[PDB]
Amino acid sequence: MLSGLNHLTLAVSQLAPSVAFYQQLLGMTLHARWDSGAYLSCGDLWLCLSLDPQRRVTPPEESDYTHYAFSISEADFASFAARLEAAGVAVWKLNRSEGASHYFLDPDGHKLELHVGSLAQRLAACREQPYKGMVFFE
């Protein structure tokens, strides 16, 4: 039986800018680095950066909607978004759903998000206003 997300691995084209982004800009803890990657943590998340010459710096119009959202409190959201803005980090989408969300790109174009709110919160909102074709499972 699967018990959760064990780790997220992102392929990166250049290790040093990716470490700078995740450790210094985003505040994740760097536990180890080697010639072709790094291990960080973000709360319970184990993140691996893997240096990969196949990684392309990918514009957001060229990738699909697959994306990775990090948790932040409502109280901290606006100042963290402003930090990303000051750093010139590109936005790939505006928020139109429930709960605060800031949609930003990593140095290789990985699609990231800051989001406030849980799955339970989303399901409660959806129960009140279901999406087209929505059905729930108890």
Q: Which stretch binds Mn ion (CB under 5 A): 1-9, 73-81, 85-93, 125-133?
A: 1-9
Range 79-82 contact pairs with CB under 8 angstroms and sequence separation of 24 or more: 80/114, 81/114
For residue 94, the minimal CB distance to a copy of itself (Å) is: 16
The partner residues of 76 in beta bridges, in order of sequence, read none
* Residues of this chain, 30-49, that bind a copy of itself according to CB under 8 A: 30-37, 39, 41-46, 48
What does 130 interact with, of ligand SZ7, a copy of itself, Mn ion, none (CB < 5 to 8 A by kind)?
a copy of itself
CA nearest 11: which of 117, 107, 115, 123? 107
When asked if residue 118 is in the footprint of ligand SZ7 (CB under 6 A), the reply is yes
Which DSSP string corresponds to 30-58? EEEEETTEEEEEETTEEEEEEE-TT----
Q: How many of the other CB atoms lie within 10 Å of CB of 131?
A: 6
Write out the binding residues for a copy of itself, residues 117-136 only, by CB under 8 A.
Answer: 117-119, 122-123, 126, 130-136
Q: What string marks each residue from 52 to 81 as x (binds Mn ion by CB under 5 A) or -? A: -----------------x------------
* Beta-strand pair 101-105/111-115: antiparallel
85 contributes a contact to a copy of itself by CB under 8 A: no
Give me the residues that bind Mn ion (CB under 5 A), please. 9, 69, 113
